[PDB]
Amino acid sequence: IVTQTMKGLDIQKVAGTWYSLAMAASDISLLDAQSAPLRVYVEELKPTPEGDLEILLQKWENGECAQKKIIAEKTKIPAVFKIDALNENKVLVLDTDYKKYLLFCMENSQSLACQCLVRTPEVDDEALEKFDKALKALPMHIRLSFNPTQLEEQCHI
Template sequence: MKCLLLALGLSLMCGNQATDIPQTMQDLDLQEVAGRWHSVAMVASDISLLDSESAPLRVYVEELRPTPEGNLEIILREGANHACVERNIVAQKTEDPAVFTVNYQGERKISVLDTDYAHYMFFCVGPPLPSAEHGMVCQYLARTQKVDEEVMEKFSRALQPLPGRVQIVQDPSGGQERCGF
C-alpha cells in the first residue's frame, strides 16, 4: 500500500501544469450515489490544502443525499478549532450530470470522475472560480472503511493527468470515523 501511494505521488509530481480536472463520468445516477461513504484517500495539487487536520480542504465525506431539485447534499466532517465539526453543503447541479458547483471557501467545481455506486467513488474539487491558481483536491470514497488495493490502483490511474506537484494523504484513521484530534 505504501509503495503504491509513493508510486502514485511520484508519477503525479511529473504531470504538466494545466488545471484541468481529469475526464468525468458521462452519466451519474444521483439515487445510486446516495448513502454512507468513507474518505479513504485524498490527493492535492498543493499539500497545504491537506497537511493538517484544519487544512482548508481536508474534509471527510460521510453521506451523500440527492435533493428533489437534482442537487446533491454533502454531509461531511472537518476540523475547526481542534474540534470535529459536521457540515452540510449543497452542491448545485450543472448541465453535466457528473459536475456540480459548491460555495465552499469560494465557488468551486466538483467533478465525479468514476464510481461503481456499490463500492467506490472518485471525485475532484477544483480551485475557486474564476481562477488560474492550482488548488485541486481529489478523494477516493468507499462504502466501507476497508481500502481495496485494486480500487486504489484505479484511483491512481484516474489521477495520472492531474497537474503539478500532487501529494497523497492516506486516511490515517486506521478505518475509524474521524476528524481526529
C-alpha cells in the first residue's frame, strides 16, 4: 500500500534514541486498546554493520509495560526491512533528516500502522505536518499523539 520511500537512506545514521510522537493505523483495533497489537513505543534503533536494524521498544502486554527487542532484516531496497517474526511484516522508511524526525510505516500481507519519530521529547509541529501529509491518502482510521510529559514515561502513561 505505501509508495513513499526515502531515496538515499543511510540506515547507519538512524542509530540511537527516538520517541514515538504520533502514530496512526488503517484499522482502529490496531491501536485502540492499550495492549493493541501495533501500539508500540520506539526506544532506540541499533543498525548492525551488515545493515539490519535492531529495534528496542516498549509495548503494554498482560497489564504492564514490557520491553521488546526486534530485528528487522535488510532487503534489496534500502528503505524496506522485513521483521524476523510470524508473517514477515515490512518496515518502510518514508522520510528522515536523521537529526530531528523519521517517518516509517509497517504493513502485513491489508493492515498498516505508521509513526512520526523524533529525537527529543518535544512536539515538532513541522515533523507532524510531514507525517500528516504522508498519511493524507493512506486509509488511516485512528491517530494518536503524545505530549512531552507522556513521551518521558514508560508506555507513554
